[PDB]
Design an enzyme around this catalytic site. Structure first.
Site, PDB file in Angstrom:
ATOM      1  N   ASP A 217       0.830  -1.197   0.000  1.00 35.99           N
ATOM      2  CA  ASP A 217       0.000   0.000   0.000  1.00 35.99           C
ATOM      3  C   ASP A 217       0.867   1.251   0.000  1.00 35.99           C
ATOM      4  OD1 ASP A 217      -2.952   0.369   0.057  1.00 35.99           O
ATOM      5  OD2 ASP A 217      -2.497   1.688   1.746  1.00 35.99           O
TER       6      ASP A 217
ATOM      7  N   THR B 276      -3.363   4.911  -4.127  1.00 35.14           N
ATOM      8  CA  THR B 276      -2.472   5.729  -3.315  1.00 35.14           C
ATOM      9  C   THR B 276      -1.048   5.766  -3.850  1.00 35.14           C
ATOM     10  OG1 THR B 276      -2.179   3.815  -1.874  1.00 35.14           O
ATOM     11  CG2 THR B 276      -3.806   5.451  -1.233  1.00 35.14           C
ATOM     12  N   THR B 277      -0.680   4.844  -4.737  1.00 36.00           N
ATOM     13  CA  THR B 277       0.644   4.844  -5.342  1.00 36.00           C
ATOM     14  C   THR B 277       0.678   5.558  -6.684  1.00 36.00           C
ATOM     15  OG1 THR B 277       0.910   2.664  -4.322  1.00 36.00           O
ATOM     16  CG2 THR B 277       2.629   3.390  -5.830  1.00 36.00           C
TER      17      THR B 277
ATOM     18  N   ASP C 147      -8.735  -2.121   1.137  1.00 35.96           N
ATOM     19  CA  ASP C 147      -8.731  -1.518  -0.192  1.00 35.96           C
ATOM     20  C   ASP C 147      -9.884  -2.042  -1.036  1.00 35.96           C
ATOM     21  OD1 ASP C 147      -6.566   0.020   0.403  1.00 35.96           O
ATOM     22  OD2 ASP C 147      -5.205  -0.901  -1.050  1.00 35.96           O
TER      23      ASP C 147
HETATM   24  N1  LIG Z   1      -4.331  -7.350 -14.085  1.00 35.10           N
HETATM   25  C1  LIG Z   1      -3.790  -6.152 -14.407  1.00 35.10           C
HETATM   26  N2  LIG Z   1      -3.291  -5.922 -15.639  1.00 35.10           N
HETATM   27  C2  LIG Z   1      -2.751  -4.737 -15.970  1.00 35.10           C
HETATM   28  N3  LIG Z   1      -2.661  -3.695 -15.128  1.00 35.10           N
HETATM   29  C3  LIG Z   1      -3.124  -3.786 -13.861  1.00 35.10           C
HETATM   30  C4  LIG Z   1      -3.726  -5.050 -13.421  1.00 35.10           C
HETATM   31  N4  LIG Z   1      -4.095  -4.874 -12.140  1.00 35.10           N
HETATM   32  C5  LIG Z   1      -3.756  -3.608 -11.790  1.00 35.10           C
HETATM   33  N5  LIG Z   1      -3.174  -2.962 -12.815  1.00 35.10           N
HETATM   34  C6  LIG Z   1      -2.682  -1.564 -12.796  1.00 35.10           C
HETATM   35  O1  LIG Z   1      -1.714  -1.372 -11.767  1.00 35.10           O
HETATM   36  C7  LIG Z   1      -1.835  -0.049 -11.243  1.00 35.10           C
HETATM   37  C8  LIG Z   1      -1.488  -0.025  -9.762  1.00 35.10           C
HETATM   38  O2  LIG Z   1      -2.509  -0.683  -9.019  1.00 35.10           O
HETATM   39  P1  LIG Z   1      -2.271  -1.108  -7.486  1.00 35.10           P
HETATM   40  O3  LIG Z   1      -0.787  -1.258  -7.262  1.00 35.10           O
HETATM   41  O4  LIG Z   1      -3.177  -2.279  -7.207  1.00 35.10           O
HETATM   42  O5  LIG Z   1      -2.821   0.121  -6.604  1.00 35.10           O
HETATM   43  P2  LIG Z   1      -2.278   1.625  -6.758  1.00 35.10           P
HETATM   44  O6  LIG Z   1      -3.094   2.194  -7.890  1.00 35.10           O
HETATM   45  O7  LIG Z   1      -2.548   2.232  -5.405  1.00 35.10           O
HETATM   46  O8  LIG Z   1      -0.816   1.457  -7.070  1.00 35.10           O
HETATM   47  C9  LIG Z   1      -3.265   0.388 -11.502  1.00 35.10           C
HETATM   48  O9  LIG Z   1      -3.274   1.696 -12.076  1.00 35.10           O
HETATM   49  C10 LIG Z   1      -3.821  -0.609 -12.496  1.00 35.10           C
HETATM   50  O10 LIG Z   1      -4.218   0.071 -13.688  1.00 35.10           O
END
Ligand SMILES: Nc1ncnc2c1ncn2[C@@H]1O[C@H](COP(=O)(O)OP(=O)(O)O)[C@@H](O)[C@H]1O
Ligand SMILES: Nc1ncnc2c1ncn2[C@@H]1O[C@H](COP(=O)(O)OP(=O)(O)O)[C@@H](O)[C@H]1O
Ligand SMILES: [Mg+2]
Ligand SMILES: [Mg+2]
Ligand SMILES: [Mg+2]
Ligand SMILES: [Mg+2]
Lengths: 364, 105, 147, 77, 540, 96, 525
Positions: free
Chosen positions: E72, E105-106, E403
């Site tokens: 997170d 949040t990232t 989340d």
């Molecule tokens: N299965 C997936 N395939 C491609 N991109 C993904 C997938 N899951 C999440 N993402 C991308 O990763 C990014 C980071 O998501 P995450 O690390 O879960 O939370 P945060 O947005 O707080 O970093 C998101 O903007 C999302 O678009």
């Protein structure tokens, strides 16, 4: 000191192997009673031999199994070398006690201490149908003064507490009574206050307090009691000045500040049943004794002695004397060693020669 | 209008309805709690019946305050002083809203 | 506030009825006192001490303006300028002790909240000079000049 | 200190200009009182009691102990 | 370039203005902007490796040595012990994103870092920072409008939870609990849907009790439509299982009554003592009989009770629980549909809550017991029970499930979604670039810098997945331009296709809009600061 | 670090105005008052302790002034003019 | 640019930050250090450690338990902290397998370090390890055998499991005696899982073979002064009442009288109330009265006058164990004697153990609570006997709860490794290499078992791998001689739950540690 366990536990060793050896001494003292030095010497020699055994290229697991086999064989050899003994043979008991005392400062006084130890052990147990000796039934009292030749084996009990009733001592044909309540002004467990709104009430307060104390003392006296033991009390004063004066006027020797943990021993020794409420204080709960007196040890303190008791209990008390404190402590340790030897003779009644004979026989 | 943060709700607050379509608001400066009648008040009794009567009297004082509030027709109760768990549960049982320690402003 | 004893005040409750009626009786007494004060025509009350919550509530109920002058000097000066006498108890004031003024109101000057006791006549026992300025030191110097 | 990574201080912009002007003004104000027929002389104690009484600007600026380079410029001038 | 001012007057007299000005520090203008941009870039570059399914975690250690492993962004930045003020601004930005949304949040930190990185070269080219901020605001407005345009709506009906499950799975894909991906998604969706006011109202998180216990397995985490209580039955000989329990919630300790007011009961005679003891015994018997008469099978108390009451409860076949916390009392009352009763006299049958099964749960060789209440009729409170192999994964599962709950709450608040994996960012960048062409020359640089900053998220995702960033992002952008499909993103998981609509990578529209808005506002603040006055004392 | 930067060196003092004139005149007056009582046929003598352990019991003004140490530069100028008067003509040192 | 390697200093004083390679280096070093420390205490030929404390008391502790080794050390490496918490949680879940799970996690992380050195992204390693964990778990579940239906076969399984658990500990000297001891103690619980119902009493002195399970129950309390010390056909009443100047629970009560005679009357009333309470208890028709709380002098005297044994200050555990062993009800009110169940036992007497006196309950009614007397030569020996017996009891209780069993001696690890390898030979990409490393660690576990005995570990492990390849699914390490053998015949058995938990926890911790690419420390307090 000469006791191995005492020497080992008195000095901090700081090394785990040495601490384990100290624990080994404690275990040997607990179970056997003496030999606390021989066991440590044996363990040290065994490990010293293990050094050369390991240097030869032997895993320290075959060594352990071989040592177990050697231990079993040696136990068998020692059992085969042993000789049966019975508690009716006083000579063997005296010999064992003398042998135990032979290596201590009281080797010269053994001629007095060994019969004393044998009598102390045999007077607190039943010679037939006995499997162990509770050494807590043999109270040891250390009084500075005199020499070790002044050790004594009072059959009753000796109390370090002094007689509050200064003026009357040496009660003969005593009827001892032990109470666990307080001889003072009335007081309830829950919060209590006396409110006075008139001078007549103020006079009646102490008038009735005096009457209540006098009634308590009269109830105690009517039973025929003449020696009173009072348990130590903290919350409420156990013995008031008025109560002491009333007891003195009726010729009763009052002894207060009796410790709580000493109640069981006193009741076993005398036969007095404790009383916690004056309602149940009857004549049948008193411990009859032949003589209860306070004796001074030639200016080195005062001891209260109760010798002679109807239906005496299975407890004895040993009074240990000495010129200085160190020899008194060592004499107490040596007497404890002798008592432990007799105790471990009570269970597993088997005897072997000393003088290093078992060790050399085991070696061969 | 007016808006302010939630102020340390007690137990049973989540059982109160959180939306009213025409509420009458009771603005109070009152500590609705089971407490001593006064800081320098002492009760002296010498009978168990009087003891039970005193306990019931404290409970009845609190319940009289609560019932006087309830019978006014108000549905939202706000106080500048703490409102206890007993009062919060009482208001919850009547489908009312309560909030204690509301700032003076 | 309702006056209290000077040695020690202990509310000795012995029955449930007294416990239930004590607060009601105290509140009724305070309400009676405030209403007796208000029935004399007084609409402004100036006190030199702490203001009780129930006293404030009942003053609000009867439309009474409350001012709490903490310092005794200000209390004496207000008594001089208005024509009233500082009563020692909470009794309603008599006609001779009655204070009169042309206007009392709450006003803001700059960012400071002030309470003004204003006489329409160009007379009285005390007059006040309201000093404005852009600096504290400047106003202090002007005050020295006024002195 | 920062990404430049030089072992020393650094003043840039209006700050250094103001510092230079301050140094020059200090040097000027040192000798401003010794100008014209209504000027007055000066005493210069030399840290061991030696006294030099003078009105000449060159002597005053040469005997002074100056450290700012923008002021050493005026002294050498 | 620091230490305030140092002139000491033209006339050599002391010149002191600011208190202790010889130890303070200050920075002015362009280099201050450069230092701020550098600090923000450092923070963003640190955070950018925890983005996407292939993002890695950070092992964070506090002052006391306690270790937490997390992904997170808000938690990572909160655990950091930073001193730079811009770092604190970044941490507060992440906290704001967590508070309003709970997800993304990232992304906000990376976006702000990219925006400031582009503003660095914009300033180096000679543009007033206010112009940069205005251009960023205009581009953010354009991007938000485009997000509204390409948004898609989903159904938030209880009958079909498939889109909600897909959204929860997308949220959880980057966390360590993806080994139980669909299970956690389902439990989060069911938890949110259970405790919610269906009229698009709020979701009260105080009705969701998230509690974890070590042992078991992560797959053992389950949704309990009731309450988990750390307490157990008061008497050790009380039965460990109650069926069809009629709950009796009480807040009165099972003790003789005690007035709050300072009171004294006077005992003046033996009759008074006898009456007092008989009164105590009768009060105990009466309270137990009053509890029994309502027909209740279980008794829940908040303030504990004593031995006589305990044995009377055991003797009358009423299992009881004591010392239950106030929040737990409220949750039990809500779930079982029973009122909270302040004293025995007011207890009645209609105030009794009903629970299908009340059971005491053991946890192996730990001696720690725990109480479960479930199988209620219409429980309006839910509990999530998390099991794991160590406490670190338990805490990480807690925050990951939080989340997911926040994401489903956002979906309830507004059901419009956009397709993730960088597709939304690429489409927004394309829209911003197209809008820049029609704009006058001077703001075009700011618009294109905003577009390039928006492009960082797909490049970060491609870098974290091992693919070449520039080539992959360029190919995806070209495909988006060629055929009109704003759903093409970065194939992080290497599923073969680039269409995120088929891959079911779904994020809330509110999340993206909040990301862009918050990043733009914080970047505007950071750009507007041109002076710092630290004490510079380096105090202990 | 960041040692202070300033125009003149440290331990460099400077005073100006009426203060300097008053101080100079007061220093001269003090020099005069030191030997004011050593003038005339009824002058008293003074005993001066040489730092090298010697003793100078004298009535002459120039010896008294040259045997004392002063820090104010105006007093130094006064002592210098006393020495000049002594060298040029021989007497009149405590009158000038 | 990174936070630490930036021209501006962005951190507080004393706070640092470790990037990818440095964080991986520190994590791997800590994990390998923990694994190397905890191992060599594994298998039948494992050795014990000495835990010498640095505190003022300087507590000395000899131990073979991995969890106790790991918890009682000063750990500063965060990954080492993760492994320590893993071991503690594993101990909490089941009593065994702490060393096994710690060593498996360390070996997995060592293989992960090798793979990272071979330029493999850690996410690929994690995915391959997830697949390998699935395959290994499925194989282990398929390999489980259950004998709960047959009571004699289940008894044999319990004996084998207890022997296997005690093989590595100090009790292996008297393994047979202690195995019978633990099996009987667990079987006496009648299916209940509360190990707190089994009390372990450590008395210094005597041989370790002198330890025994009392046929009844033993209490470390004492009897009153004037009460009987021996009772036959006891009718015990267990209570949790005051019996210490029992005050009426009205807090505000007080005595306000105008004369001392009234005070004496109130005191007599209090004493009469206590007497009435004692009489109400005696109305139950009892011989021995056990109270959880203290018993003051007046109730003690009243009990003594009635010839009723009165054991006082038996704590919560004491009264619970007495209720379990005798069947009585822990009461607090005595107005309904007919509704209180009374415990019963054949004999109550005082027995002399060492130099201490204990109360002995013989011929108990229920007996669903055990006391075990441990005799030893040193305090450390007693502590290790207690710890090893606790491990055995925990594993036996888990086996009673779930009767599925797997074969030990490396057989289970080798079969899971074979399944993982077969899966790896079926998968393309570097995930195959990750699964191969997984199987390599799984095989490294019995390799360490063999190394601890000084045997030819490489040859034995190769033989086991071959034998499992041809389909000998019960082959394992025969530690008596140093060959391979049939664990079905040799009776080397383990609980399926323990092995499953070990595998899953080790995989979980390796996965969570491998996911970390940066370690950030705040300024220490
Ligand atoms: N299965 C997936 N395939 C491609 N991109 C993904 C997938 N899951 C999440 N993402 C991308 O990763 C990014 C980071 O998501 P995450 O690390 O879960 O939370 P945060 O947005 O707080 O970093 C998101 O903007 C999302 O678009
Ligand atoms: N008699 C035996 N023969 C072969 N292997 C054994 C035997 N007893 C125990 N083991 C093995 O030793 C391993 C380690 O057990 P142990 O050293 O007691 O610590 P832990 O059980 O905590 O890992 C177990 O996995 C078990 O398979
Ligand atoms: Mg000896
Ligand atoms: Mg996310
Ligand atoms: Mg002359
Ligand atoms: Mg084991």
């Amino acid at each position: 000191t000469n006791d191995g366990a005492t020497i080992l536990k008195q000095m901090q060793v700081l090394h785990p192997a040495a601490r384990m050896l100290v624990e080994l001494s404690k275990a040997q003292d607990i179970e056997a009673g003496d030999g606390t030095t021989s066991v440590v010497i044996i363990a040290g020699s065994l490990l010293d031999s293990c050094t050369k055994l390991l240097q030869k290229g032997i895993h320290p697991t075959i060594i352990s199994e071989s040592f177990q086999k050697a231990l079993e064989k040696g136990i068998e050899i020692l059992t085969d070398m042993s000789r049966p003994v019975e508690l009716s043979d006083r000579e063997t008991l005296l010999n064992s006690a003398t042998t135990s005392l032979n290596s201590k400062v009281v080797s010269q006084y053994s001629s007095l201490l060994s019969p004393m130890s044998v009598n102390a052990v045999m007077k607190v147990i039943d010679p037939a149908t006995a499997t162990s000796v509770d050494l807590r039934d043999i109270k040891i009292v250390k009084k500075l003064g005199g020499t070790i030749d002044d050790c004594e084996l009072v059959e009753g009990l000796v109390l370090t507490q002094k007689v509050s009733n200064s003026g009357i001592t040496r009660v003969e044909k005593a009827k001892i009574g032990l109470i666990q309540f307080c001889l003072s002004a009335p007081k309830t467990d829950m919060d209590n206050q006396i409110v006075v709104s008139d001078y007549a009430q103020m006079d009646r307060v102490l008038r009735e307090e005096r009457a209540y104390i006098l009634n308590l003392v009269k109830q105690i006296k009517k039973t025929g009691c003449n020696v009173l033991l009072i348990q130590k009390s903290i919350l409420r004063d156990a013995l008031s000045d008025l109560a002491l004066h009333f007891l003195n006027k009726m010729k009763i020797m009052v002894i207060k500040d009796i410790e709580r943990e000493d109640i069981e021993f006193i009741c076993k020794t005398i036969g007095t049943k404790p009383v916690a409420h004056i309602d149940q204080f009857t004549a049948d709960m008193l411990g009859s004794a032949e003589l209860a007196e306070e004796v001074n040890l030639n200016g080195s303190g005062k001891l209260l002695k109760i010798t002679g008791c109807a239906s005496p209990g299975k407890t004895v008390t040993i009074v240990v004397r000495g010129s200085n404190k160190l020899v008194i402590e060592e004499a107490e340790r040596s007497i404890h060693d002798a008592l432990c030897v007799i105790r471990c003779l009570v269970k597993k009644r088997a005897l072997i020669a000393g003088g290093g004979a078992p060790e050399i026989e085991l070696a061969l | 209008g007016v808006a302010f943060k939630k102020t340390f709700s007690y137990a049973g607050f989540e059982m109160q309805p959180k939306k009213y379509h025409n509420p009458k608001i009771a603005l109070l400066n009152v500590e609705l709690e089971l407490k001593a009648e006064k800081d320098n008040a002492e009760i002296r009794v010498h009978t168990v019946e009087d003891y039970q009567a005193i306990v019931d009297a404290e409970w009845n004082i609190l319940y009289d305050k609560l019932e006087k509030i309830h019978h006014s027709g108000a549905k939202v109760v706000l106080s500048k002083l703490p409102i206890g768990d007993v009062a919060t549960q009482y208001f919850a049982d009547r489908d009312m809203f309560c909030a204690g320690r509301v700032p003076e402003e | 506030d309702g006056m209290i004893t000077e040695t020690k005040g202990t509310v000795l409750i012995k029955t449930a009825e007294e416990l239930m009626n004590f607060s009601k009786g105290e509140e009724n007494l305070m309400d009676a006192q405030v209403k007796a004060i208000a029935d004399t025509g007084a609409n402004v009350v100036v006190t030199g001490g702490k203001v009780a919550d129930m006293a404030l509530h009942y003053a609000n109920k009867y439309n009474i303006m409350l001012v709490r002058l903490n310092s005794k000097w200000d209390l004496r000066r207000l008594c001089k300028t208005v024509g009233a006498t500082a009563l020692p108890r909470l009794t309603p004031p008599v006609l001779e002790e009655m204070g009169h003024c042309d206007s009392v109101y709450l006003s803001e000057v700059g960012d400071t909240q002030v309470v003004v006791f204003k006489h329409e006549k160009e007379d009285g026992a005390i007059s006040t000079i309201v000093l404005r300025g852009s600096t504290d030191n400047l106003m202090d110097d002007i005050e020295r000049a006024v002195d | 200190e920062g990404p430049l990574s030089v072992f020393g201080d650094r003043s840039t912009g209006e700050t250094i200009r103001s510092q230079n002007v301050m140094a020059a003004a200090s040097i000027a104000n040192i000798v401003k009182s010794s100008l014209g027929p209504v000027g007055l002389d000066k005493m210069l104690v030399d840290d061991i009691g030696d006294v030099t009484i003078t009105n000449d600007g060159a002597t005053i600026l040469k005997l002074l102990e100056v450290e700012h380079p923008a002021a050493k410029v005026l002294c050498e001038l | 370039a620091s230490m305030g001012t140092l002139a000491f007057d033209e006339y050599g007299r002391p010149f002191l203005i600011i208190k202790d000005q010889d130890r303070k520090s200050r920075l002015m203008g362009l280099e201050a902007l450069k230092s701020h941009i550098m600090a923000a870039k450092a923070v963003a570059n640190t955070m950018r490796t925890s983005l996407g399914p292939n993002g890695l975690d950070k092992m964070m250690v506090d002052k006391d040595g306690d270790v937490t492993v997390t992904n997170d962004g808000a938690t990572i930045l909160s655990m950091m012990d930073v001193d730079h003020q811009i770092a604190k601004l970044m941490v507060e930005l992440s906290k704001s994103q967590d508070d309003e949304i709970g997800d993304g949040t990232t992304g906000v930190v990376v976006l702000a870092g990219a925006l400031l990185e582009e503003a660095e070269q914009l300033l180096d080219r000679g543009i007033h920072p206010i112009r940069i901020a205005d251009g960023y605001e205009q581009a953010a407005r354009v991007a938000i409008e485009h997000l509204d345009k390409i948004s898609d709506s989903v159904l938030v009906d209880i009958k079909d939870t498939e889109p909600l499950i897909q959204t929860a799975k997308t949220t959880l894909g980057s966390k360590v609990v993806n080994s139980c991906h669909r299970q956690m998604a389902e439990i989060a969706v069911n938890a949110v849907l259970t405790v919610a006011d269906m009229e698009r109202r709020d979701v009260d998180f105080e009705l969701i009790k998230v509690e974890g216990k070590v042992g078991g397995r992560l797959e053992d985490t389950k949704l309990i439509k009731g309450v988990i209580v750390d307490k157990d039955f008061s008497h050790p000989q009380m039965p460990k299982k109650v069926e069809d329990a009629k709950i009796a919630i009480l807040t009165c300790p099972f003790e003789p009554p005690k007035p709050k007011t300072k009171h004294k009961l006077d005992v003046t005679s033996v009759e008074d003592y006898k009456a007092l003891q008989k009164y105590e015994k009768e009060k105990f018997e009466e309270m137990i009989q009053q509890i029994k008469e309502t027909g209740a099978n279980l008794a829940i108390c908040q303030w504990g009770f004593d031995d006589e009451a305990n044995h009377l409860l055991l003797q009358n076949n009423l299992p009881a629980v004591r010392w239950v916390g106030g929040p737990e009392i409220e949750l039990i009352a809500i779930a079982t549909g029973g009122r909270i009763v302040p004293r025995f006299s007011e207890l009645t049958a209609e105030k009794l809550g009903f629970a299908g099964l009340v059971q005491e749960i053991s946890f192996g060789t730990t001696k720690d017991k725990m109480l479960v209440i479930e199988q209620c009729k219409n429980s309006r409170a839910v509990t999530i029970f998390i099991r794991g192999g160590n406490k670190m994964i338990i805490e990480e599962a807690k925050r990951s499930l939080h989340d997911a709950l926040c994401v489903i709450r956002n979906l309830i608040r507004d059901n419009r979604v956009v397709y993730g994996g960088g597709a939304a960012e690429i489409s927004c960048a394309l829209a911003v670039s197209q809008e820049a062409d029609k704009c006058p020359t001077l703001e075009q640089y700011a618009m294109r810098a905003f577009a390039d900053a928006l492009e960082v998220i797909p490049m970060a995702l491609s870098e974290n997945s091992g693919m070449n960033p520039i080539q992959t992002m360029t190919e995806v952008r070209a495909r988006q331009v060629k055929e009109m499909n704003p759903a093409l993103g970065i194939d992080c998981l290497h599923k073969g296709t680039n269409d995120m609509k088929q891959q079911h990578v779904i994020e809330t529209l509110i999340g993206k809009k909040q990301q862009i808005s918050l990043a733009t506002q914080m970047v505007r603040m950071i750009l507007k600061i041109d002076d710092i006055r630290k004490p510079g004392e380096s105090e202990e | 670090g960041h040692r202070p930067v300033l125009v003149l060196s440290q331990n460099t003092k400077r005073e100006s105005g009426r203060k300097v004139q008053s101080g100079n005149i007061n220093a001269a007056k003090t020099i005069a008052d030191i030997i004011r009582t050593c003038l005339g046929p009824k002058s008293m003598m003074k005993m001066l302790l040489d730092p090298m352990g010697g003793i100078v019991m004298t009535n002459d003004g120039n010896a008294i002034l040259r045997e004392i140490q002063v820090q104010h530069p105006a007093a130094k100028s006064m002592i210098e003019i006393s020495r000049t008067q002594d060298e040029e003509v021989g007497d009149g040192t405590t009158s000038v | 640019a990174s936070l630490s390697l930036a021209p501006v200093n962005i951190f507080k004083a004393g706070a640092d930050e470790e990037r990818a390679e440095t964080a991986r280096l520190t994590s791997f070093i800590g994990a390998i250090a923990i694994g190397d420390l905890v191992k060599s205490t594994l298998g039948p030929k494992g050795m014990d450690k000495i835990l010498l404390s640095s505190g003022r008391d300087a507590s000395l502790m000899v131990t073979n338990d991995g969890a106790t080794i790991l918890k009682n050390i000063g750990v500063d490496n965060p990954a080492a902290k993760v492994l320590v918490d893993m071991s503690r949680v594993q101990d909490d879940e089941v009593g065994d397998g702490t060393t096994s799970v710690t060593v498996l996690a360390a070996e997995l992380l060592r293989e992960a370090e090798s793979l990272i050195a071979k330029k493999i992204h850690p996410q690929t390693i994690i995915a391959g390890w997830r697949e390998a964990t699935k395959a290994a778990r499925e194989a282990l579940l398929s390999s489980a055998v259950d004998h709960g239906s047959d009571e004699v076969k289940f008894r044999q399984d319990l004996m084998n499991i207890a022997g296997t658990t005690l093989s590595s500990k100090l009790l292996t000297h008297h393994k047979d005696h202690f195995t019978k001891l633990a099996v009987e103690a667990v079987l006496r619980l009648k299916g209940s899982g509360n190990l707190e119902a089994i009390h372990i009493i450590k008395k210094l002195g005597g041989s370790l073979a002198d330890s025994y399970l009392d046929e009844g129950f033993l209490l470390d309390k004492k009897i009153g002064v004037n009460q009987p010390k021996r009772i036959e056909n006891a009718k015990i009443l267990i209570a949790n009442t005051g019996m210490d100047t029992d005050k009426i629970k009205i807090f505000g009560s007080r005595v306000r009288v105008d004369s001392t005679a009234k005070v004496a009357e109130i005191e007599h009333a209090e004493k009469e109330k206590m007497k009435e309470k004692v009489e109400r208890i005696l109305k139950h028709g009892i011989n021995c009265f056990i109270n959880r709380q203290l018993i003051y002098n007046y109730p003690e005297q009243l009990f003594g006058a009635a010839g009723v044994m009165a054991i006082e200050h038996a704590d919560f555990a004491g009264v619970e164990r007495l209720a379990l062993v005798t069947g009585g009800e822990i009461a607090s009110t005595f107005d309904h004697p007919e509704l209180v169940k009374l415990g019963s036992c054949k004999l109550i007497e005082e027995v002399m153990i060492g130099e201490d006196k204990l109360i002995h309950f013989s011929g108990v009614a229920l007996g669903e609570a055990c006391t075990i007397v441990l005799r030893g030569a040193t305090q450390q020996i007693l502590d290790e006997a207690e710890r090893s017996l606790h491990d055995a009891l925990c594993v036996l209780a888990q086996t009673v709860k779930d009767s599925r069993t797997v074969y030990g001696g490396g057989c289970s690890e080798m079969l899971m490794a074979h399944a993982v390898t077969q899966l790896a030979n079926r998968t393309p990409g570097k995930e195959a290499v990750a699964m191969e490393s997984y199987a390599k660690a799984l095989r490294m576990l019995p390799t360490i078992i063999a190394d601890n005995a000084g045997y030819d570990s490489a040859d034995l492990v190769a033989q086991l791998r071959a034998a499992h390849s041809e389909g000998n699914t019960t082959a394992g390490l025969d530690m008596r001689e140093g060959t391979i053998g049939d664990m079905a015949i040799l009776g080397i058995t383990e609980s399926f739950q323990v092995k499953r938990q070990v595998l899953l926890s080790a995989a979980e911790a390796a996965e969570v540690i491998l996911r970390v690419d940066n370690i950030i420390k705040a300024a220490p307090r």
